[PDB]
Amino acid sequence: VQPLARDAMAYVLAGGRGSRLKELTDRRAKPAVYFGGKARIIDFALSNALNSGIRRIGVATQYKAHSLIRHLQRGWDFFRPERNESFDILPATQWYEGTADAVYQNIDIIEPYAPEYMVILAGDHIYKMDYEYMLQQHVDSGADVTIGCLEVPRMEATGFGVMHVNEKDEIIDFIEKPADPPGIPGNEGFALASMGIYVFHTKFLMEALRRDAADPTSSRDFGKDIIPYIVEHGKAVAHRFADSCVRSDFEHEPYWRDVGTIDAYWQANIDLTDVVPDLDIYDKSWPIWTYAEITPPAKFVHDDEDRRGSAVSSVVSGDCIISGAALNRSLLFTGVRANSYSRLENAVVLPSVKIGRHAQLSNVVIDHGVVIPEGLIVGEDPELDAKRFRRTESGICLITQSMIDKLDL
Amino acid sequence: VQPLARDAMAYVLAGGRGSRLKELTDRRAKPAVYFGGKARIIDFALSNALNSGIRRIGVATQYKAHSLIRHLQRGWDFFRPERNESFDILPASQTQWYEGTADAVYQNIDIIEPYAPEYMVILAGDHIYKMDYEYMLQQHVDSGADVTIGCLEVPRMEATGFGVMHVNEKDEIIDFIEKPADPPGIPGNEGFALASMGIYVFHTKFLMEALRRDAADPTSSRDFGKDIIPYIVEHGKAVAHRFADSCVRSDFEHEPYWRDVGTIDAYWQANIDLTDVVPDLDIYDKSWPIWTYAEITPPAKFVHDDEDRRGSAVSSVVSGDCIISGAALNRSLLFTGVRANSYSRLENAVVLPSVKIGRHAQLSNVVIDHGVVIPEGLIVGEDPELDAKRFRRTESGICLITQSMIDKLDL
Amino acid sequence: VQPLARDAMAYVLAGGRGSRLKELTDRRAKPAVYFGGKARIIDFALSNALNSGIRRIGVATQYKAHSLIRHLQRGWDFFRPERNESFDILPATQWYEGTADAVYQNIDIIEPYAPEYMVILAGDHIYKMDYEYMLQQHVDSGADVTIGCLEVPRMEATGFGVMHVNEKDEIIDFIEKPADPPGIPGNEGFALASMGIYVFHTKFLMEALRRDAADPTSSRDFGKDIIPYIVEHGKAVAHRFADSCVRSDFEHEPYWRDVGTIDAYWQANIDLTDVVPDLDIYDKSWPIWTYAEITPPAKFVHDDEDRRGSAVSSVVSGDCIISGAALNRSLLFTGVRANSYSRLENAVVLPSVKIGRHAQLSNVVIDHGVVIPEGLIVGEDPELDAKRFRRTESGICLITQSMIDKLDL
Amino acid sequence: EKRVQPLARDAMAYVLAGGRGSRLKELTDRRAKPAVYFGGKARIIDFALSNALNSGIRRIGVATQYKAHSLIRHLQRGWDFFRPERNESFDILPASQETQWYEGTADAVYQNIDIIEPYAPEYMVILAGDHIYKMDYEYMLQQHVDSGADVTIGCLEVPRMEATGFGVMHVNEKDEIIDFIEKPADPPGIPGNEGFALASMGIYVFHTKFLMEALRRDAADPTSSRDFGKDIIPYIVEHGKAVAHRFADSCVRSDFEHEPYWRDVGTIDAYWQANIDLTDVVPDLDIYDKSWPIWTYAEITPPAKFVHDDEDRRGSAVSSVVSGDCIISGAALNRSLLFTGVRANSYSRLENAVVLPSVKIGRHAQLSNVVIDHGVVIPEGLIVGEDPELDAKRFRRTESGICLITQSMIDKLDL
């Protein structure tokens, strides 16, 4: 009779340590990692909730949340309770004992709002999805939990929490990374991979997590304790990402990215420099909100036979001054200073980085605020680079300031 | 002890047609004209008021002000009355419009009175400059003047096109002259003259009766520069305040910066000079920021790198949400949202927001109005007689391009 | 599945004079008249749009617009275009030569948004409605216009532009203020009363308006020209208020008021003093947004035999100081200051009113900011009362500052 | 130089808000003292924040600690209007920057040097965030640079009998501090005017340069309790120059406030008194002074509604202060102060009651000389203020007969 997103509350689990992103997540959680030239990773789930019409949002934080909390304070500050909206930042006596405990310790935050539906969201993935489709299916199916799932070729799901399904898209088994992922009935060769997105009726959810906290035997996680429990003792249904995903007209397939490794993080950002990227960051119909300040425009200067500031096949944010520096196939976040006779290629450059004169960097990820000393060469000597910085097996160097300062060169 | 701006209300006069900007001000008052890549002209005076600590701002607008008013509604929306801040947009009505710039104040006494400020800072809303108004506020009460007037220190040859302040040894105004052929020089500093910036400071009580006396005078032109100021220069006490004293000069600004941008060449030159390696105006300054209306936009993007086409910008300023797809930019300033397409070329171009450049177009020495769609293959800057017959072209060689003109050509 | 509000624009008509409110609207448009103790009239239509899910709103203004426009600038300032929200104030040859011209002159504001549906609203009524219902009837009905109608007893409708329908609620004729109004077939005694709420497909509305500006015989009005044009040539289906009205559990009937006359304005505000008011201003599930400031609480002072500052069976806003004044069956907006030995009864007191000592006013509407001189008496001399101020037949006095200024006797 | 621009442009206010409100007992059990409500809408911390705002300080940092959940949430929702590109900043700084908490009140600044120094403020204004007072810090800033002092301290001029509970500053003819004693049993006196002493408000103005010096060389010394008044301040009064700034010179008074207002509300009786005092005809604190307004977090709420007038119930407030969204239904209120959302029902009576937000007073309940905690649902027929011995056993009753009532005591309730 009315749209269901009115009665929904998005609960964002943003306690991801990153870990596999190494120094990139040393002083910040993975949802706080920058992506795309402007936003952060957590901005996609939050914008999905906003654009789906969900007016109540909770975000549970955990590992090194100081930068994430400050981002959510400064950027997602426009919710007003008297308009029936709310944005609750819910940081962790001591740590949360998992991710279902992240919902248990904040019952007294949710239950005052009395939402009828809770949309449990992973806050460390890049994707655009209309959660109204997932809410309608949860009501129409009468399930205890609806789980969003990717349709992935049956060889990529080997590194995924895979749900096996029958012909009515009801989940009959969950397997953590099966060696031979079970396929879709009548559509073998594709398996359903878990997105970490679950829809519950709130009364059912409050009861389920409460039983979990009364189980000293439990690890207090949705995927290892809660989700297997309804899969076996109850009713679980799968929601396919392709049904809910919001595709631009310049998007060639449903887009979802885990950016779990340094190589995957690098590839997802550099792919935005392509002629027609997989992710349309120019889409106005399903916009991504984030914290942004009014910045001066980007500037390209110098044009001698010695030095020319210019960008080619590149994405350049505002407040960037490209002073006699050559940029090719590079993505620059806000406020980057590149100085004369320097050159960057295949570089993901996080905000407020300064490139010293005569430096030459190839196939790199430069962390926030790093000052690259004058004349530094990266991407030329693999063994020297693997000694000075963190180098992936395909030649991408993660460069942090603590690596830079520990060089007598 | 206490700062004077706490008890001051900046009153910005924003009803300037800027007639000599021609089609650039067709449907837009001069304070609403875009400048510098992101801001509009009126944002400088308002940002000077804010950064000087003046928490009450009134903006008087006149002709074709819908786009200016919407800018003020959207960009300057953060003032809170219960924190003793206010931002009043005061368009003419609430019999015709404002009879003059002094009537612009007079019609709005009942807006000014409830605030009861002790000082009134009358600002021109159509100039580009940075200034700390507390210095001027400080000189006013220490001088006992009836009005303090902000003045540029310009060489006498260039002061001939200004309203010039004749000043004695105490910088007291003994005569005001409209565009003198031989401008009176500063005593002891001949060769320089004092040119009015249109910045005034009054005690609010003094100002209210002046404009009320001006309103009860049928002879009056109802204008500050013609009726109120020349009245004080001879019957009251008028003192000049020197812009060099109060100008907020960035460390990378070689001189006090003030631009009128009163003609198309002057508007073009002021914008295009921000592409210098060291510009006169520092748009990367944080100590005295210029606030404006801005939205979150995607970054600028450059695509294609062939021998046929290469998207790139050299010696240029490029705002966000600009897609430079196989287009070659040189010495150009692009506002937000520009789409430049394959095989096109821009040189010495000021390109206002949301302009599309079609493939194979080549434009040199241009000002392209907001939202203009340049047809594919158009050439500007190559045939002066053809460009002048097609567009508004200055005698210096700069074309102003509007969509009306583009729609008016088979050729 | 998708809510239709996501793709609609609410276009509020707020250029009304409210002439039978007399000096209450001498310097304000009727949509800017205060109502309820904190809000103004137009806030209800705007809140209905916001709560229905509509985030693109345009408000056309005309007569006495400054305080209305200043109200919209500072109260409805939280919309952000890059979140696909918009709020346009449209005071945009002289004025609006009608009401259909109010849209025609602002097509250049509308069709760039390219909304799929237009919801044309009257901005001078007090009501709570979910516009998703009428949108969800419009696109299923396939009509060229859905018109919101109140089902009123047939002798109330004599002041309405009345339409009658068949068994399928299809509008066959439109009669403006019928002396003997046509009743609904089958169940007569009641009639459909048009509320001035129109729903269109945007592409249809644009043509209907441009063909209405083509005809020179046109008064350029919806209800007078375009609306009767479609029921004669196109398809119109009425929509019943009771199906869409948002009623609290404490509102015993669908609430809608016109407050067209001073007596009707007084009545609607004073009825809020009831124990069980017809309008529940405490319904948080459909809240009315307005311009509001942080204000001090209400203060009640003095308690002697001669003076006692207190309010009984009244509604008192913040920043109100009831100092030795006795209030009874009154409603006070923010900022009122009633001083010692004064007495108010059956009074609607607009913001910032000052009641001097010993003043005793009864059955009045006091205009915004009026200073009541000490010892003034109203309500005891019906003959003297009509001579100083404006008295209705029922004996309600509207008091403005100008009436007080001219008071010798 | 200048001598024209205000010093506040180059200052940053650092609000210490990590206190426990020790003697407020159950009122600060799940709130820090800066988060305790005061006045009818605002919380205690809003006064120091508003003083900084209205003084011209656009850079604020708030250090939190003990049970900071609702305090931090209050700061996120209310104090959210600062924009860094306008040279404004509001930093919420919880104690997670190391080992457990902040070692002290000076540790709260040293742990956050990395946030302070990029701003590069010229002057540091250290504020206690648990006092009710209105003050223009610009007077203190300008005094600091004309004095050449190392630290300037805000001081209350109180009779020496009352200065026995404060940190007392011993000054000379030039109000230059000679000594500091922690709560002297017989405090020293001011030259030219003894019978009075200078008591520390906990307000310190530093040159940021030297403060960073004093804080870094205070972390690397295990002799220090890592506090300003206990460790930093006494160091300067000995090795440098410490000057006393008197609240009477910078206090912002209304036309309706007859004396420099400063309250500590450190106990339940003091807290109850400070709120009830607002119901007086001429209050000591003028909450209607719009020249120095107190900003806080507030929502659009419905008005206050009074209803019923029979022979035995009449909803009415007398000599009281009633906030919005209050429905006084057949309830009589006298000498009370009600925050937001309070629901008082028929035949109930309140006298001398400070009623925090969203309290519900049940029918026939009669309460006298009480402080009711936020959200407490008073059961029907409850009688408080009638039986001193039984009220003392059921609730937190003060030595002067004020009962603090929390929900943790309404549930635990018997004969």
JSON list of N, CA and C in Angstrom, two decimals, chain B residues 35 70 97 106 110 144 154 169 270 289 294 330 363:
[
{"chain": "B", "resi": 35, "resn": "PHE", "atom": "N", "xyz": [33.06, 34.23, -12.49]},
{"chain": "B", "resi": 35, "resn": "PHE", "atom": "CA", "xyz": [34.44, 34.67, -12.54]},
{"chain": "B", "resi": 35, "resn": "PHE", "atom": "C", "xyz": [35.36, 33.67, -11.85]},
{"chain": "B", "resi": 70, "resn": "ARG", "atom": "N", "xyz": [18.70, 33.38, -6.96]},
{"chain": "B", "resi": 70, "resn": "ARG", "atom": "CA", "xyz": [18.80, 31.94, -6.74]},
{"chain": "B", "resi": 70, "resn": "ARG", "atom": "C", "xyz": [20.20, 31.54, -6.28]},
{"chain": "B", "resi": 97, "resn": "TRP", "atom": "N", "xyz": [11.32, 50.42, -9.63]},
{"chain": "B", "resi": 97, "resn": "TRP", "atom": "CA", "xyz": [12.41, 49.78, -8.89]},
{"chain": "B", "resi": 97, "resn": "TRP", "atom": "C", "xyz": [13.01, 50.78, -7.90]},
{"chain": "B", "resi": 106, "resn": "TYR", "atom": "N", "xyz": [17.13, 53.23, 1.43]},
{"chain": "B", "resi": 106, "resn": "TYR", "atom": "CA", "xyz": [15.98, 53.91, 2.04]},
{"chain": "B", "resi": 106, "resn": "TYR", "atom": "C", "xyz": [14.75, 53.01, 2.10]},
{"chain": "B", "resi": 110, "resn": "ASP", "atom": "N", "xyz": [13.02, 49.44, 7.56]},
{"chain": "B", "resi": 110, "resn": "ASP", "atom": "CA", "xyz": [12.38, 48.49, 8.47]},
{"chain": "B", "resi": 110, "resn": "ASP", "atom": "C", "xyz": [13.02, 47.11, 8.42]},
{"chain": "B", "resi": 144, "resn": "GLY", "atom": "N", "xyz": [36.13, 60.24, 13.64]},
{"chain": "B", "resi": 144, "resn": "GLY", "atom": "CA", "xyz": [34.94, 61.04, 13.82]},
{"chain": "B", "resi": 144, "resn": "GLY", "atom": "C", "xyz": [34.28, 61.45, 12.53]},
{"chain": "B", "resi": 154, "resn": "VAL", "atom": "N", "xyz": [45.70, 55.14, -7.56]},
{"chain": "B", "resi": 154, "resn": "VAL", "atom": "CA", "xyz": [45.99, 54.87, -8.97]},
{"chain": "B", "resi": 154, "resn": "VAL", "atom": "C", "xyz": [46.78, 56.00, -9.60]},
{"chain": "B", "resi": 169, "resn": "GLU", "atom": "N", "xyz": [46.13, 66.92, 3.53]},
{"chain": "B", "resi": 169, "resn": "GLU", "atom": "CA", "xyz": [47.21, 66.20, 4.18]},
{"chain": "B", "resi": 169, "resn": "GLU", "atom": "C", "xyz": [46.72, 65.18, 5.20]},
{"chain": "B", "resi": 270, "resn": "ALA", "atom": "N", "xyz": [41.07, 39.37, -17.09]},
{"chain": "B", "resi": 270, "resn": "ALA", "atom": "CA", "xyz": [41.14, 38.99, -15.69]},
{"chain": "B", "resi": 270, "resn": "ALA", "atom": "C", "xyz": [41.00, 37.48, -15.51]},
{"chain": "B", "resi": 289, "resn": "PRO", "atom": "N", "xyz": [39.39, 32.92, 2.35]},
{"chain": "B", "resi": 289, "resn": "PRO", "atom": "CA", "xyz": [38.72, 32.15, 1.29]},
{"chain": "B", "resi": 289, "resn": "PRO", "atom": "C", "xyz": [37.51, 32.86, 0.71]},
{"chain": "B", "resi": 294, "resn": "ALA", "atom": "N", "xyz": [28.52, 25.79, -4.63]},
{"chain": "B", "resi": 294, "resn": "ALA", "atom": "CA", "xyz": [29.19, 24.71, -5.32]},
{"chain": "B", "resi": 294, "resn": "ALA", "atom": "C", "xyz": [28.51, 23.40, -4.98]},
{"chain": "B", "resi": 330, "resn": "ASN", "atom": "N", "xyz": [44.72, 24.96, -24.48]},
{"chain": "B", "resi": 330, "resn": "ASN", "atom": "CA", "xyz": [45.94, 25.73, -24.21]},
{"chain": "B", "resi": 330, "resn": "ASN", "atom": "C", "xyz": [45.55, 27.13, -23.77]},
{"chain": "B", "resi": 363, "resn": "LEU", "atom": "N", "xyz": [38.47, 27.19, -31.51]},
{"chain": "B", "resi": 363, "resn": "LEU", "atom": "CA", "xyz": [38.10, 28.51, -31.00]},
{"chain": "B", "resi": 363, "resn": "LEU", "atom": "C", "xyz": [39.30, 29.16, -30.33]}
]
